[PDB]
Amino acid sequence: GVAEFNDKGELLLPKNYREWVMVGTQVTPTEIATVYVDPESYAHWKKTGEFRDGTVTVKELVSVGDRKGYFMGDYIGLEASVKDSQRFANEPGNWAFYIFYVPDTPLVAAAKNLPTAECAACHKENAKTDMVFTQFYPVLRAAKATGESGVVA
Numbered sequence: 600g601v602a603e604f605n606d607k608g609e610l611l612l613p614k615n616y617r618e619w620v621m622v623g624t625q626v627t628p629t630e631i632a633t634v635y636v637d638p639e640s641y642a643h644w645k646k647t648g649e650f651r652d653g654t655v656t657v658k659e660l661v662s663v664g665d666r667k668g669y670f671m672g673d674y675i676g677l678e679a680s681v682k683d684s685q686r687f688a689n690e691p692g693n694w695a696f697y698i699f700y701v702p703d704t705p706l707v708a709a710a711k712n713l714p715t716a717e718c719a720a721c722h723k724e725n726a727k728t729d730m731v732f733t734q735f736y737p738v739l740r741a742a743k744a745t746g747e748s749g750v751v752a
């Protein structure tokens with residue numbers, strides 16, 4: 600997979616993740632969150648309907664701008680999750696969860712996996728598919744069902 604770790608086992612900040620496959624957009628009444636899946640893992644999903652070993656997701660938070668509508672403003676947070684059956688053999692679903700920054704806190708270059716109770720517990724109890732909240736990510740179910748990442752006529 601594309602995840603890179605430092606010698607202490609902390610996840611390094613992913614590079615160029617805004618070029619990954621956007622799977623979801625959530626609006627909080629105000630923030631916008633964009634969820635990405637790395638491209639090789641997205642290709643595997645489209646083919647199999649499963650998250651491969653090595654899947655990386657990123658959730659990027661922005662503030663909201665006003666249009667005279669609303670649009671993406673300033674970047675204010677970044678979180679990530681990584682699936683790895685060998686590195687995370689003792690986590691639910693073999694997923695680890697990371698904060699790179701949240702509003703009012705500084706960006707770190709490398710993030711430590713959080714304890715199971717802080718993130719994985721909610722994901723494993725509420726996510727539709729293998730601890731990823733695919734119920735909110737319409738690109739994923741469509742891609743598996745049609746083999747395509749878009750509408751077809």
Ligand code: HEC
Pocket residue numbers: 625632634656657658678679680696697698713717718719721722726730731732733735
């Ligand atoms: C329930 C109380 C949650 C806890 C605790 C955490 N997360 Fe979560 N996560 C939750 C939801 C409902 C969603 C869908 C998008 C949204 O914000 O509404 C998510 C999504 C993510 C993602 C995107 C990939 C995915 O699994 O869907 C990531 C990378 C993510 N969340 C990270 C994350 C971290 C680092 C957490 C602990 C600090 C954490 N989540 C806790 C619900 C809940």
